[PDB]
Amino acid sequence: KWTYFGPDGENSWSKKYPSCGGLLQSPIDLHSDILQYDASLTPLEFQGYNLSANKQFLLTNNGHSVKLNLPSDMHIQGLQSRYSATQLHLHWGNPNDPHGSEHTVSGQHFAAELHIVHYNSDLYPDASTASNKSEGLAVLAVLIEMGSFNPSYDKIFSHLQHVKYKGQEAFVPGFNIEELLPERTAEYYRYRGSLTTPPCNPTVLWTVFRNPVQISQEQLLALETALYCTHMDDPSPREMINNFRQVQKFDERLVYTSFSQ
Amino acid sequence: KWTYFGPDGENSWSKKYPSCGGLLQSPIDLHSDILQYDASLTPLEFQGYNLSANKQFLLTNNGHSVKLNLPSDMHIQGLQSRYSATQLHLHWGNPNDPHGSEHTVSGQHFAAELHIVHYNSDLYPDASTASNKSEGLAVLAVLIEMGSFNPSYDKIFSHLQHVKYKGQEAFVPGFNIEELLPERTAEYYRYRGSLTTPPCNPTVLWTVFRNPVQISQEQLLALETALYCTHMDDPSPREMINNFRQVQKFDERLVYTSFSQ
Ligand SMILES: COC(=O)c1cc(S(N)(=O)=O)c(Cl)cc1SC1CCCCC1
Ligand SMILES: COC(=O)c1cc(S(N)(=O)=O)c(Cl)cc1SC1CCCCC1
Ligand SMILES: [Zn+2]
Ligand SMILES: [Zn+2]
């Protein structure tokens, strides 16, 4: 039901989803006053990200984003439990304003944002169970700027016309998900926060990479014009655009950085 | 009951104040891509701003800001209707993150923000009646940054000691409120928006001056540290900090400017 625009938009989410008005909300603006270097933030290792090109993975329009299902053998090594992948998805703006990242850096939006959602598979048997438990989820966020054409992101974007409407599903051949990450993944921001969508559970360990990746203007325009929040037969179609939450107050949180300067 | 933090903070305002989740919400980021010069935007005239030094004006801590009551002979000339003053108040951050303006410019907060609230006295008998009506309110916003000591702002800040707690009141002798305005008041941003606090009625014509004023490090710290949201005999005192709303989405809309250069 919830949306990003109009009466069911973000200032109203808390009416139906109490955690959206709770503590530890994401996303946030990353700026100097709230950053602090933490030398304990060692490099993550990305295991099983190189999905077999002979296997296929389900892409689905869920009414709010486009998501790709990921296999539980794919995981992050380096956190205090193993976190296994469950899905990736994006957030973006619109053709006339391609500035739809969720996190901002010193007050500025990037064009888009990729989230790769993982869950604590050591403790929980699936991501839904994990999603309402403390530090049950770990999301990796990649900031996306308008730049060069990106063939790795196009392995997703080339299938958008086959998931235009809510409920639609398509198969994507496997590819190396690490190709979606930026340079120098050892440099990141780390903070305790929440799902950026209803039900906004405050159960996410966030890692936002310091460096953005680039996709082209034409890739952003495809992403911003391919998809609808509504079903194929809905008489009141709604374009899937501007699907990012505004930044949240940082109720006395610090953001820890793995880089000093 | 509403606050800027915890369960009753800004994401939950729309439960009891539905307009907080409606159209035309303020504040917004004033950024270059949405600015448009409008030659119709002529200089306002500030009439009756030189308050009789022989009258006294009520300063209150209302639990959300510090407000000074203003007299209805003080008014703006230059708009469609006369808008008569009713009150002024401020918004600020906190000493660890001293960047608590409501409006932002190109994504950047200023240290604080002063609002001089006026109502349409040609159409309505008083500010309360005007506040939920068409063309009801006009607010002048001054952005504040740290710099040199500002004697005129000290005409308010010297009384903060006396209104530390919710409910408390002091009297301030009349002074020239135009002294709180920045240089080159002819230069401003103008847009239709809302109260930035509950009930968030979309009835405000905003005028945000282009140029900030300065107050000293000591004055900004006094403002951030002088006040509490709670009553004097509350066993759980809360400091009055970070009393600004996050910026709202503003799509397919312009902010008009009285300046091009
Ligand atoms: C429309 O987006 C979602 O619904 C969704 C978004 C995020 S985000 N944007 O990365 O904070 C996360 Cl961590 C989980 C979910 S859904 C969650 C996925 C794990 C299983 C439980 C449902
Ligand atoms: C705590 O701040 C307020 O309550 C308040 C704030 C604003 S703002 N921040 O300038 O948008 C305005 Cl326009 C009116 C009011 S109260 C309004 C004053 C006119 C009579 C009705 C009540
Ligand atoms: Zn997301
Ligand atoms: Zn105000």
Residue numbers in the entry:
A (entry chain B), B (entry chain A): 3 to 263
What does the paper say about this structure?
We divided the compounds bound to CAXII into pairs according to their similar binding affinity. Compounds 5b and EA3-3 in the active site of CAXII were compared in Figure 3C. The 5b is well defined in the crystal structure. The binding affinities of the two compounds for CAXII differed by a factor of 2.5, which is insignificant: Kd_intr = 0.020 nM, ΔGintr = −63.5 kJ/mol (5b) and Kd_intr = 0.0080 nM, ΔGintr = −66.0 kJ/mol (EA3-3). These compounds differ structurally by meta-substituents; EA3-3 has a longer and more flexible substituent (-NH(CH2)2OH), but both meta- groups were mostly exposed to the solvent, so they did not contribute much to the positioning in the active site. In addition, the para-cyclooctyl groups of both compounds occupied the same position. Since the chlorinated compounds had less freedom in the active site, the differences in entropy and enthalpy of the slightly different binding of the meta- groups compensated each other: ΔHintr = −43.6 kJ/mol, -TΔSintr = −19.9 kJ/mol (5b) ΔHintr = −39.5 kJ/mol, -TΔSintr = −26.5 kJ/mol (EA3-3). The transition from 1 to 3b and 5b shows different changes in affinity and selectivity; compound 3b bound distinctly more strongly to CAIX (−17.5 kJ/mol), CAXII (-11.4 kJ/mol), whereas compound 5b bound more strongly to CAI (−12.6 kJ/mol), CAVB (−13.3 kJ/mol) and CAXII (−12.6 kJ/mol). Therefore, regardless of the compound, all ortho-compounds occupied a similar position in CAIX and CAXII, and para- occupied another but similar position to each other in CAII and CAXII (respectively).
